[PDB]
Amino acid sequence: PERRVRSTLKKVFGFDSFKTPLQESATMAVVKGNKDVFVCMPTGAGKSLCYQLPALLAKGITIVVSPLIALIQDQVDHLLTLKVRVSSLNSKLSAQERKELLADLEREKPQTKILYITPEMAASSSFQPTLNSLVSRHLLSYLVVDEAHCVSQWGHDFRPDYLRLGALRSRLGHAPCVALTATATPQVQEDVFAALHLKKPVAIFKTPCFRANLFYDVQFKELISDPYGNLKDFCLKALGQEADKGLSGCGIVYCRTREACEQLAIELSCRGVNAKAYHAGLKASERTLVQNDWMEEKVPVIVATISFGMGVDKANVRFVAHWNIAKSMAGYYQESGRAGRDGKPSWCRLYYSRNDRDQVSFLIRKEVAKLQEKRGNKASDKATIMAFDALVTFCEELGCRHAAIAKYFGDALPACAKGCDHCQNPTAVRRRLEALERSS
């Protein structure tokens, strides 16, 4: 049973082991085939294998619903390299290729083992009789819904087409349904379980957010006499973890505006921590050179706009400081998460001010208004604002920082080992929050 999976994992996919025990558990739950399965794992965590490997071990065919043809083509190309009998039914096909594939699907024992299809195609009149005979001959082993968050108006990429999939899942009652995505809050997950008609109990495999080696804190700029000086000492502590070597590792400072970038770089450089600005304002050549200087550790600190952001990863980022609050919890998570990739201790600090909150609050309304003029209203618009309010709440509440990140994304209470300001000294955080209330 576990041997069949290991055998196929090697002989077909050419892997000695699963990337993670979570990927393994997901894969085994799909193989057993007794439950609907929800897989929520970031890009690169091997989500695809969690349905592709079980598809090869089942007796019948696996249908994979994916929302655009670019995405479909990605895995078809890869599975073909593996000598897997994959097909795609889409309109980027000759009328002849379409008919050849529909004919294959009418066979007792189709050549096709895995079929990739758009939600458009899965509903189209052309396909219904094919789908019906696949049902009738009990040839469907799995229905897979990729990008399952697209069914939710509260996710970032709602698609009406996805609303038909619950009906499809119901008709394919014989077969287990696997739904996958990189991105789902608890509300998006509840929408996925309801709108796709997933059968309870739904087995869930969700990669935790929690980063044990990241120390999170929020500082209130309004309560600090020398903000720039506070930031410099933060940089010094974080870059000072091997004093013998001198300066060790690197850091990112995130800012809202190009001006603030340029200015923060000058202020830091003055105070003894060499920092260079990286933003859309610079010539392409200047950006390549600044990024290079950071990558090769000529310059230890890079100051970037949240808007332009960072194009490249680095293993020894010892700190990420948000000078200005980010636009969303997800943005903050991703930007701060550039820290500590090598697994060594790193520091993530958010410099909060109600003045910054109000600036961003309003800019978000403006960018939402601009989208509403060009394409009308959308429940995503409310999502964008709540995504920011979650981060404001993170800044203004007392409570474990890792716990607040976990709660937003729908993870279990994480094991913070005095790994944030509130868990290290609850009273000091309370002190600072009480002080911020007085400045109101």
Partner: nanobody, 124 residues
Amino acid sequence: QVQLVENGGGCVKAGGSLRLSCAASGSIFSINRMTWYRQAPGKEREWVAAITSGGSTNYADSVKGRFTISRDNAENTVYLQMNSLKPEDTAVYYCEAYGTYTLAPTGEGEYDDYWGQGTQVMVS
């Protein structure tokens, strides 16, 4: 998975009060709808009261005013305060945990409905 264990049920005189408590065990993140049911001897199950996560409540007409459903968010526990009890209220009371999201720090979880065991309520 999850255990729903109801308590607070006991023999009581008419006009009196009880408070029923249902505790939900396990790695619970959230419960969509929590509903109080009761089963009177030789009657069909009767819907009593429900509370959403969010605290929106609703009551059968036979109990509105007398019964109040509430939640301790901290403890995954719901309460049914019952005042002005009548013989008609004599039943076994159990709770339904509809849309229960469980999840371990490993990232393995479940979405399911759970049913309690029942607590005996006897009104003289």
